[PDB]
Amino acid sequence: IKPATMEFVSLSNGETIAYQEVGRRNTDILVLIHGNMTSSQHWDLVIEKLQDQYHIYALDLRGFGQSTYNQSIDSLQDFAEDVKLFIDELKLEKFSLMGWSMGGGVAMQFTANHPTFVEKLILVESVGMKGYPIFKKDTNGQPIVSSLVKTKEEIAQDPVQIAPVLDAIKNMNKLYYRTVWNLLIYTHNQPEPDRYEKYLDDMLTQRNFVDVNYALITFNISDEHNGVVGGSKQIHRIKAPTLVIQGDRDYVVPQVVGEELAKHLPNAELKVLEDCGHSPFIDCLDVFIKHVEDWLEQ
């Protein structure tokens, strides 16, 4: 159940990033960015399928996995800046980039800011271009859909979406996470039990949950205000050929999100995967890998 063996690189901003590096004798480079509640360990299934052909770097973002969290992040751009410092330290010059969920937001922000480094971009159930809002909760724990959270302090007070996660991390409560993931993600298929245990251990490594939720409510690369923050207009700067992967039963990132990304990205193709939720890796790995391989080989 142990995590993969990790490499470590110290960055000029005082963080030390943990990463997996596999397929080191291969030519084409692929960089993988995980999402919320996960680290690079959640890329295991993709890594196993692609490491025979690609030189893969899968990093733990600051405050996840085995990376440090010496300074707090305020935005997904903070993660993208870490990725830039990371690729500078390792002297990577061109690579393809794939991000899952919140990691799709980081990947988009990175690609907008560092166009000369990104050959191809793949977004997997990515957060949308106007971020991921949090609503106040009623006495039944249901969202009050005209009561929008706007500050980090409000996020820290949420007793349904936020407080129980912080408590589960403090108390190392894997059962809480198993219940949540079975309800929202692993609704039709689950990881094999040993892999699921590794994933649950991975969730407990997160040290920045509130900060990441704040970065998600304030993420906005569109041309329009999202109700919390104005848009940076940067989605128009993503000229890399982009594949938008979206599941037809993703209960975390609904289908309209991927359709909107493909619409607004300048150079994007949308693939909606049948019988697929937030984890294509568990719901349809073979089909997902074929789409990725075809995109990378184009």
Side-chain angles (χ1 to χ4, degrees):
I1 48 72
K2 304 302 181 122
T5 59
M6 308 295 282
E7 304 292 332
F8 297 86
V9 62
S10 290
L11 313 179
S12 59
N13 65 1
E15 304 294 340
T16 295
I17 297 300
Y19 62 106
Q20 295 176 65
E21 185 193 351
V22 301
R24 309 184 182 193
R25 318 307 189 188
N26 292 317
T27 297
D28 292 336
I29 300 171
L30 172 65
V31 172
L32 304 176
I33 307 181
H34 65 80
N36 204 6
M37 288 183 177
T38 63
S39 78
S40 71
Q41 303 304 319
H42 270 73
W43 284 114
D44 59 348
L45 285 164
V46 169
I47 284 162
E48 283 162 22
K49 286 275 180 299
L50 295 180
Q51 68 190 352
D52 66 330
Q53 274 299 9
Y54 296 92
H55 186 179
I56 302 172
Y57 297 80
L59 87 171
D60 292 350
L61 293 176
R62 207 200 298 186
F64 294 93
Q66 297 178 42
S67 298
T68 55
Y69 198 58
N70 293 326
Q71 301 287 349
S72 50
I73 63 97
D74 304 299
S75 69
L76 299 190
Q77 160 126 1
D78 290 336
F79 289 131
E81 176 174 6
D82 284 356
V83 175
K84 178 60 165 45
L85 298 178
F86 174 93
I87 66 105
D88 291 348
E89 285 295 335
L90 296 187
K91 302 304 290 202
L92 306 189
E93 310 207 339
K94 292 283 208 155
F95 48 87
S96 293
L97 181 58
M98 180 156 64
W100 179 34
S101 206
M102 176 268 279
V106 176
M108 279 189 292
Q109 184 69 85
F110 180 91
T111 302
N113 292 345
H114 306 284
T116 64
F117 287 89
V118 179
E119 312 184 61
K120 313 251 184 51
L121 177 62
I122 303 181
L123 303 174
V124 185
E125 320 305 304
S126 173
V127 66
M129 60 175 196
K130 286 170 172 180
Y132 199 89
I134 296 175
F135 297 99
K136 298 295 280 189
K137 309 300 191 299
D138 67 24
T139 52
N140 295 318
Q142 302 300 301
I144 302 163
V145 296
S146 290
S147 198
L148 197 56
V149 167
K150 297 189 197 171
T151 68
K152 191 175 298 205
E153 301 87 289
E154 295 184 80
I155 294 173
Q157 295 309 127
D158 188 308
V160 172
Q161 192 165 345
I162 303 299
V165 174
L166 302 185
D167 202 49
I169 293 170
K170 175 182 272 233
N171 296 125
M172 295 185 68
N173 183 358
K174 288 189 254 192
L175 200 36
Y176 168 83
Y177 276 100
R178 186 188 288 276
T179 306
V180 164
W181 278 70
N182 287 357
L183 185 76
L184 292 183
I185 298 184
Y186 300 139
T187 55
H188 293 63
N189 297 286
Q190 277 182 35
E192 317 105 271
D194 291 339
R195 191 181 317 275
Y196 205 172
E197 192 79 3
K198 184 182 68 182
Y199 286 174
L200 295 162
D201 288 339
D202 199 32
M203 300 169 197
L204 297 173
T205 67
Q206 178 164 16
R207 296 299 174 258
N208 58 9
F209 192 65
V210 171
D211 292 339
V212 167
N213 277 270
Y214 179 73
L216 284 162
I217 76 170
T218 57
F219 182 66
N220 189 353
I221 57 171
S222 87
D223 289 332
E224 300 181 328
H225 199 280
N226 73 355
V228 182
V229 295
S232 72
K233 311 181 267 52
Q234 291 189 284
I235 191 154
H236 309 308
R237 307 179 188 185
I238 306 172
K239 53 212 183 253
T242 303
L243 175 63
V244 181
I245 293 296
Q246 171 72 57
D248 67 355
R249 56 162 168 80
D250 185 335
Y251 303 133
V252 176
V253 177
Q255 185 171 321
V256 285
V257 175
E259 296 176 335
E260 182 181 70
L261 287 177
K263 167 179 178 179
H264 287 269
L265 286 161
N267 190 18
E269 310 203 10
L270 173 68
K271 292 313 198 344
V272 175
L273 301 185
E274 189 181 23
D275 202 15
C276 185
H278 196 56
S279 173
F281 325 124
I282 292 300
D283 277 328
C284 49
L285 183 63
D286 294 331
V287 166
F288 170 81
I289 289 295
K290 175 170 271 283
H291 288 315
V292 169
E293 288 176 340
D294 291 350
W295 199 252
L296 296 186
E297 296 167 359
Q298 276 190 241

